[PDB]
C-alpha cells in the first residue's frame, strides 16, 4: 500500500496486486529473491525488474502505446519478511516457436545486471498450459532408453572415465569397456571431451563403437554411451552428431551429450529438433554463476531444470513456490527430464540415496566413488547392489 | 611451502610453483579468485579447481597415464593476501576448431558448482600467440563500421528503442527512423526483439529497411540497424539471417545481434563464420551471474570481453592481471571487439565520457538519456556535441 | 444494469461494460444493429451472439478453461435506444498469417444465422495497429496505375 | 445409424492438447465424428501442427480404446490457398489413414473457390462444407438472398 505510493507512474505500470488470475493462462509465473540495491524499496527495484524483463518503460516516452502497456510484465504478490517479489510475464512476449533462450534473455537476462537489486534470485518459474503449447518439451525419455537397455526396477548405472581427460581414444574406449562389462550401463564423455589432438573425435567414436559392441558380447546387455557434440559452432556439432550416427551405432546405444550453458540453449534446442530420437544429455558445466546459494543473483537449479525440460533436454545433472503441473490441459502433456546423478555413489550409498529420491527413474553417473580390484568388479558391485534393493534384500545379507 | 607439504599426492600433480615458464606458450594462463569451502586450505582449493578444470585426477586410478599428467593443469602462483590463484592450462586440453566454449567448459565450467570453495572468480585469462592461432578473432571491426557510415573522429552514436517490446514493426521502424534522421547512425533490436505475435520478424525487418531508406535519403548519411538474430535453434536463426541478407540491406546496413550468454557461444561463433562480412553485435544479458560483484562465482566482465573477442564478436557491451597482447606474434594480430555502450548518455554526458575511456572507437546506444523536443532534436543534439567534441569547442560555447 | 441480472453466468461471460480500454489493442472493435429474436432481452441476445462469435460457451462445460475465458468476446457498450451492441473480439481470436475470411467467419459467420436475433447487422469494425500488423492491405493502388497511365488531377 | 457427431465446447479458446482430450473423450464413447470449429485454425495458442499431431494421437488412443475407427474434421479454411493446400498436406502427412480426416470449408467466408479446389484436389477426402455466414442469404428474415435449398444444391454442385 505504502509502497504503491512510494512509485512513480512508470513504475506503478509494472506493479498490480490486483491481478485477477496469474494462473489465467497468459502468464508466466515467476518468483524472485529480491533485495534492492540501495535508494530503492523492494517494490521500486521490483517495478524496475518487471521493466527491464518486459518492456523497460520506466521514463516518459512519447511512443508508449497502449498495447506495449498490455505487453508489461506484472508485480503482483510481494513477501515483504522473505524478500520476494512474484511477476507475471504476458508470454506473448516470448519469441514464436519454442524460444526457450528468448525467455531466459526477458526473465534472466538484463536484470541480473542491474544495480537496483543487490540480490536478484529467480526462484521458480510457472508456465501456463498454453504457453507449454509452444514449446517441445523432451520427445526421448530415460523410458526410451530403459526400452532399449531393457533395464527396469533399478536405476540406470552409470560412470565418467577418470582420468577425466589426457587418455587416447583407445585408453578411454578400454576405460568405458571395463564399466560396461562390469554390469554398467552408461557412459558419458567428459563435458569438455572434444576433438582433442591426442584423443581425437573420429577415433574417439569409432573406439567406443568397437568397446560397446565387444561389451554387449560378453555381457547380452545392451550399452549406452554418452557422446559429448558441444562444438565450436552448430556445423562442427552436426558433424559430430552425424558421425555418431554413421559410425553406426544401433539406434539408442548413443545419447547427444550438451553442455547446455557453456554451449547455449540454441544448441539444446537444435539437438532436440534434429535428433528427437536420440537421448539429450544436458550438461550444466557453468550453472553455478547462476544456481549457486553464494551467489545472490541468478536462478535456481530448479528453473534451470525446468527450462532445460522446456527446450527438450531428455536429462540433465542435479548432484517449491509453485504447484506445477506440466501439462498442457487445465499429447496431453510434456515428457519428463531424467535426473543424472554425479559423484562418488558406491553400492554402500545406493539404498539410502534411493529412499531419499523416492524412485528408480534417474541415471546415476558415479564420480570418485569407486575409481583396486578392478572397475569392473566395482560395476558388479554397483549391479549386486541394484538387484538387492530390487529383491529387498539387505545389502549385508546380499554380501 | 607448507600449503604443498598439506597437499595429497593427486593434489600435488596440480600445483608446480616452479613451472620454469608460464608464458612459454604451451598454457593459457588464468588467475582466479578463491576462497576454499570450509576445511581446505587455499592450496587445497586449487588443486581441487586446477584437477575438475583438466583432468580430474584427486583419486588413485589404475587408468592414470603419464600424458594424462602432462595435460594437468597446474597451479603455478598463488598470493595468500589477496587470495589469488594462478593455473596454466596447456591448451591442447582445449577442442580444436577455435572452440570457445570448450575453453569455457573447462576453466568456468564445472568448477563454479564445487563445494570445495567458497568464491571462485576468474578475474583474467592470458592467450599465448601458439593457442591464438587455433581462433578466429573477429573479422568485421568498427573499422569497416566507420567505413560504411562514412563516420570518423567520433563515438558511433547509437540507440535502443523505447518501449523495448509492445510496439508494432511500423511503430519501432518510425522511432529506429526518428533517431536515425536526427543524425544518429546506430540503431539496435531489443535483446529478446524476436519474432513475435505482434512485431513479426518479416514484418519488422521490411519496416526497418524502408524506414532506414528514407532516413538515409533525407540524410544523405548511411545507417546501420542491429538486428536480434537470436532464436530457437540453428535453422531459424539463420532463417532470420538470410532474411535480413535478402531483403535486401546494402551490405555494412545490418549488424546481427546475438544475445551471447542466452543463445549460447556456438551461436556466436557460428554467426562469425557464415556471416564474416558482418558486423557481430554480442549482447550479454545473462552476464550478471558470471560478472557481478556481488557473485562470488563467475568470471569477470574483462574475461567475457576477451572470450567475445576470441570467438570472433565485433562489438560487445561494456556499460588487469596479466599484459595481454592480441598478436599471434611472440593477420599479424586478432581484430578489435568494439565497446558497446548502452544506458543514459545524454550530449551534456558525452565529452567527460570520451575522456574517460580515452579514445572515440566504440558505440555508444543511450538508454534514459533522451527518450519532449523530440527524439530527432535529441540526436541531433548529441551529434552537435560530437561535432563540438571533434572540434574542441565546449559545450557551452558550441551551445 | 438490469439487463446485466437477466443474464446467467455463462452469458455474463461475455459482458463487459467495464471493459478499461477497448481501443488498447488487443481487440477488434465490432458495432452491431442488434434485435433479439423473441423472449430474450438485447443485452442477452448479444451476449449469445458475442458467444458464438468466440467461444460458443454459453452453458456449464468441464472443458472450460480460464485462458478460454481470456479469450470471450466481450459486450463492451450497449445502445438500447439505438438496438446497437459494442463487442470487443480478441484478436488472437482470428487464424494467424493474415486471414480475414476467418475473422468474417468469427463475427459474420453463424452469428448470421441464430435464432436468438431477428435483425443482426454489423454496422462497423475497428482495426488496431497490433491487429493490422498480421494482414497485407492493398500493395498495387490507384496511384500506381496513375503512374502508369500518366493520368492525374 | 445416423454418423454420431460432436462439436468441441468450448469453440476456441482451448489448447491442442485440450481439444484433442475433448474430442477423444467423444471418441472413446462412442462418438464417431469429431471436427473443427468453422474458424478454428493455426491460432497461436492452439497451433495447427501441434492440433493435427495432437488430434492424431487422441484418435488413434481411441481407436485402439474402442476398436472402431473414428472420423476428425479438420477446418483447412485458410488467408489464401497456398496455406490452404499446406494445411491439407499437413493432415496427409501426419500422417492419418484415409477415410480418417476429413477437410472443412467454410464454403461461404472462404468462397465457393476454396470448396472446389478441395474437391478436385482431394477426391478421396470428405469435402466437409461449412456454411458460417450464410445467413445473410438464407435467414427468412431477409428479403434477399437465396434459400437454404439454393445453397445445398450449389454445394452439391460444387
Ligand atoms: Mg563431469
Ligand atoms: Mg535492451
Ligand atoms: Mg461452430
Known sequence: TQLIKTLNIHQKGYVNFDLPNPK??????????????????????????????????????????????????????????????????PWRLFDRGGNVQNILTYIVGNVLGMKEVSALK?????????????????????????????????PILGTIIKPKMGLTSAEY??????????????????????????????????????????????????????????????????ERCELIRNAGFEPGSYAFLIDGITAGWMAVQTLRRKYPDVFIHFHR??????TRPENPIGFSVLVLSKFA?????SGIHTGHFFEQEWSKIFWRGVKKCCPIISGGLNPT????????????????????????????????????????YQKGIDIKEYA
Not at 571431451?193 to 573420429?202: E, G, M, S, V
Not at 550409498?349 to 578392478?374: E, Q, R, S, Y
Open 173 to 238: 574406449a578400454e576405460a568405458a569397456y571395463d564399466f560396461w562389462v562390469g554390469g554398467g550401463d552408461f557412459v558419458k564423455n567428459d563435458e569438455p571431451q572434444a576433438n582433442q589432438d591426442f584423443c581425437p573425435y573420429d577415433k574417439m567414436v569409432r573406439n567406443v563403437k568397437a568397446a560397446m559392441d565387444k561389451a554387449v558380447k560378453e555381457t547380452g546387455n545392451k550399452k549406452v554411451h554418452s557422446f559429448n557434440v558441444s562444438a565450436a559452432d552448430f556445423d562442427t556439432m552436426i
Open 285 to 290: 558445466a557453468g550453472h553455478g554463476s547462476f
Open 122 to 154: 529467480l526462484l521458480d518459474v510457472w508456465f501456463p498450459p498454453a504457453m507449454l503449447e509452444q514449446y517441445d518439451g523432451p520427445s526421448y525419455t530415460l523410458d526410451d532408453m530403459r526400452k532399449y537397455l531393457n533395464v527396469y526396477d533399478r
Open 309 to 313: 525440460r522446456l527446450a527438450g533436454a
Open 24 to 89: 489465467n493462462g497468459e502468464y508466466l509465473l515467476a518468483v524472485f529473491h529480491l533485495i534492492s540495491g540501495g535508494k530503492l524499496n523492494i517494490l521500486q527495484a521490483a517495478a524496475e525488474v518487471a521493466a527491464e524483463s518486459s518492456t523497460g518503460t520506466n521514463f516518459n516516452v512519447n511512443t508508449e502505446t497502449p498495447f506495449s502497456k498490455e505487453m508489461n510484465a506484472v508485480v503482483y504478490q510481494i513477501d515483504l519478511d522473505q524478500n520476494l517479489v512474484w511477476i507475471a510475464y
Open 349 to 388: 550409498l545406493l539404498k539410502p540415496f534411493i529412499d531419499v529420491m523416492g524412485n528408480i527413474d534417474f541415471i546415476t553417473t558415479m564420480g570418485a566413488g569407486c575409481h583396486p580390484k578392478g572397475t569392473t568388479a566395482g560395476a558388479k558391485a554397483l549391479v549386486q547392489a541394484c538387484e538387492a
